[PDB]
Design a protein around this nucleic acid. Structure first.
Length: 442
RNA sequence: UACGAGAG
């Protein structure tokens, strides 16, 4: 009955994602040896070469393409604490689409960092995808990160302490820069080919006394990688964050008054709160909250409640408004926001000034594509062109949007229910993306 | 699961 966890394996090409994942699957005992050899021989027949530990993640990537799904029972294995399933990994056509749309959602990210001579340098170079992948993971809101320092068996001396520390520190400063505190990240020197250190201390690694992570939830320490997968925590509702409540409708009930209606996305709504409506900037008091024809002392995330407010007319507040706590991170109007989008099937080309309608939470406002900033490869997330001339179907890009009318939006990392939007033109959804940063208006 | 950018 162990709770389930979704894993995405990110990292630079040839850094050892597939090998590490496949060897982990082998050691975890999720697949019997006979079936393992059968699938190894199948892979050898399909492609020329040796696919030992490589057929697992490569097969997963190949089965996440062109909407063909036969079986996913192979990539489900059991740790001591959880049942963990490999979902997706970079290196296929639909990776970015699955990441942005959420069809492939992951609770924790396993960054495999190649660590031998020349590898750790290349992975973080201009052409390296390590930085791209970590930035994408942070953008998507995957705040739990595992760093596998892989193929370490290749230094001189064979397992260098200072090479490990070099990678660790130069990674740690950079992700302190982007937003992961290095203390919560477990670092483990491994070689996916050797199966080094995966489930028990490696005899080749006497100096690696163990890994230690310092988290707000408490410190944890270990040696092997299985324990790293055992450090993960379950998914949960945001019932401690500030209040956020998109307005779906506002009604005028005879003998009661104005009664906005919507679903609580984060935080708590209770009677007596002083609430602020954005972007209209209207502050009032909640007279009462009703759900299931009963008076509710508090409204939890997910509760679609209707609450009565005083001194506010129905013409004052409307659909698309975001309601929040007036004295705890209150909602505010968005002057502009920067988002990363992937262009779906579009009748033509997208240029600067393109102004489609944006559907964010319950809002429906036309936003102008002010600037076409960057063009991103949809296959690996690698930056291809800066300031592209135009965008077509299949192009991933980062653009700046200016709402044509007052709009209230949030970033995907902080308030996921209000950070993802859909771009629709005519009857077609031409693009879907997530918001990175928002410039709150005065 | 159909439907949906997602919640559902």
């Amino acid at each position: 009955e162990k709770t389930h966890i979704n894993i995405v394996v990110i990292g630079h090409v040839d850094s050892g994602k597939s090998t590490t994942t496949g060897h982990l699957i082998y050691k975890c005992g999720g697949i019997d040896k006979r079936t393992i050899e059968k699938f190894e021989k199948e892979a050898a027949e399909m492609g020329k070469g040796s696919f030992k530990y490589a057929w697992v993640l490569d097969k997963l990537k190949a089965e996440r393409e062109r909407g063909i799904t036969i079986d996913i029972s192979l990539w489900k294995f059991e740790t001591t604490k959880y049942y963990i399933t490999i979902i997706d990994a970079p290196g296929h056509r639909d990776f970015i689409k699955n990441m942005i749309t959420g069809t492939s959602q992951a609770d924790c990210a396993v960054l495999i960092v190649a660590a031998g001579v020349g590898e750790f340098e290349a992975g973080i170079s201009k052409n390296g995808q390590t930085r791209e992948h970590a930035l994408l993971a942070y953008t998507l809101g995957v705040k739990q990160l595992i760093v596998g320092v892989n193929k370490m068996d290749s230094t001189e001396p064979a397992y260098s302490e200072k090479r490990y520390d070099e990678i660790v520190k130069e990674v740690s400063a950079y992700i302190k820069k982007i937003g992961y505190n290095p203390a919560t990240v477990p670092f483990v020197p491994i070689s996916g080919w050797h199966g080094d250190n995966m489930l028990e201390p490696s005899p080749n690694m006497p100096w690696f006394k163990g890994w230690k992570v310092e988290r707000k939830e408490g410190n944890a320490s270990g040696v092997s990688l299985l324990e790293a997968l055992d450090t993960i925590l379950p998914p949960t509702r945001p019932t401690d964050k500030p209040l956020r409540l998109p307005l779906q409708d506002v009604y005028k009930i005879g003998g009661i008054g104005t009664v906005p209606v919507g679903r609580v996305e984060t935080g708590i709504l209770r009677p007596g709160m002083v609430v602020t409506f954005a972007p209209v900037n209207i502050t009032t008091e909640v007279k009462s909250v009703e759900m299931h024809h009963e008076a509710l002392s508090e409204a939890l995330p997910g509760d679609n409640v209707g609450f009565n407010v005083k001194n506010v007319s129905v013409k004052d507040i409307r659909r698309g408004n975001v309601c929040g706590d007036s004295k705890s991170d209150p909602p505010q109007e968005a002057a502009q926001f920067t988002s990363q989008v992937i262009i779906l099937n579009h009748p033509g080309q997208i240029s600067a000034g393109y102004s489609p309608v944006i559907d964010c939470h319950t809002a429906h406002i036309a936003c102008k594509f002010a600037e076409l900033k960057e063009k991103i490869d949809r296959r690996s997330g690698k930056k291809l062109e800066d300031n592209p001339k135009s965008l077509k179907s299949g192009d991933a890009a980062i653009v700046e949007m200016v709402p044509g009318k007052p709009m209230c939006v949030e970033s995907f990392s902080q308030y996921p229910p209000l950070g993802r939007f859909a771009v629709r033109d005519m009857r077609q959804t031409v693009a879907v993306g997530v918001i990175k940063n928002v410039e709150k208006k005065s």
